Amino acid sequence: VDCGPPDDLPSGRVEYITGPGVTTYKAVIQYSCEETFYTMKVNDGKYVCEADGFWTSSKGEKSLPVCEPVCGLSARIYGGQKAKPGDFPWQVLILGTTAAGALLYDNWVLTAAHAVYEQKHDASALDIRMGTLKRLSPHYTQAWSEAVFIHEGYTHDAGFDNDIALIKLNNKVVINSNITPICLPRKEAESFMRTDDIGTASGWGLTQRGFLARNLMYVDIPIVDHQKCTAAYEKPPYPRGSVTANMLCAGLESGGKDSCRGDSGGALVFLDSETERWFVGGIVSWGSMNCGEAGQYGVYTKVINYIPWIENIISDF
Ligand SMILES: Nc1nc(-c2ccc(CNC(=O)Cc3ccc(NS(=O)(=O)c4ccccc4)cc3)cc2)c[nH]1
């Protein structure tokens, strides 16, 4: 038959088992992911030359396996504390005004549409920095955007419904202990995001002093009841119905702990206590001008509502 030289596995290697350069009927190859920071999906990666001339998996598939980076690993802004290396290894800095995102896989950044809209529609690549706690440091891992996807239902400067965006990177980032992606929420993930469950926001945005932070900060804050969050913003100068079902709110009735301007696009993360992995439930979106004030909650894009959209973009590009 003869199935030819196998295809390379990204973030992996193909190795001949029968012998080097041996690609005939019934022969065997072995595909491998780096198990520490990548996990092989699809199958065991044992493929055999079938009668039809196609490398075929043990399950009969004619396609490659997939090395998916390990997500949600962690070493563990108004009223918060200074992050340590590896606390938020998905944290991305995006340099317009100061903004942030979160790494997904090894080549996508999740952010807010409002944080990147002007830069996309000026047709300029985004300066994307990872692996640094210091916003102004010259030492960081550089990435560049290949493409920016704004949600088609987002209307810039006319409310924050559908305030979500994906940035495709030009190249895969090298995944190490200080640079790893956040997990997308699963079907069950809402069980960790009820009212009063605790999420974490991280960023370089304004602190209680009223200036940006030099070092990455974070704060733990509880999810707010949706009716209480709609009532907080159902008043002038906010337009009618500014808090939608595609948003969630987090903050304290007393004030003192909050995201703020400059934290835009950052991931509000939650711990799956069973998998022991962090996932993104929210994206820092908007709120009142006076961050940290009592009852003036931060508003976040509700990420689980966008999983079909995210999966459509990432699978198709
Ligand atoms: N109390 C609190 N605040 C935050 C927080 C604030 C801002 C940001 C970053 N987002 C922006 O910078 C976009 C952005 C742009 C303009 C406005 N003006 S508006 O008139 O209020 C308005 C709001 C909604 C619909 C229409 C008008 C607000 C936000 C992050 C957190 C947390 N907690």
UniProtKB/Swiss-Prot annotation:
Reported tissue expression: Plasma.
Cellular localization per UniProt: Secreted
Transmembrane segments: none
Every Peptidase S1 domain range: 77-315
Modifications made to the protein after synthesis: The iron and 2-oxoglutarate dependent 3-hydroxylation of aspartate and asparagine is (R) stereospecific within EGF domains. The uncleaved zymogen is inactive towards synthetic substrates, but has sufficient activity to effect autocatalytic cleavage.
Domain Sushi stretches: 1-69
Assembly notes: Homodimer; disulfide-linked. Binds MBL2. Isoform 2 binds to MASP1. Binds SERPING1. Dimerization and MBL2 binding requires calcium ions.
Family from the record: Belongs to the peptidase S1 family.
Protein name: Mannan-binding lectin serine protease 2
Residues of the full protein shown: 364 to 686 of 686
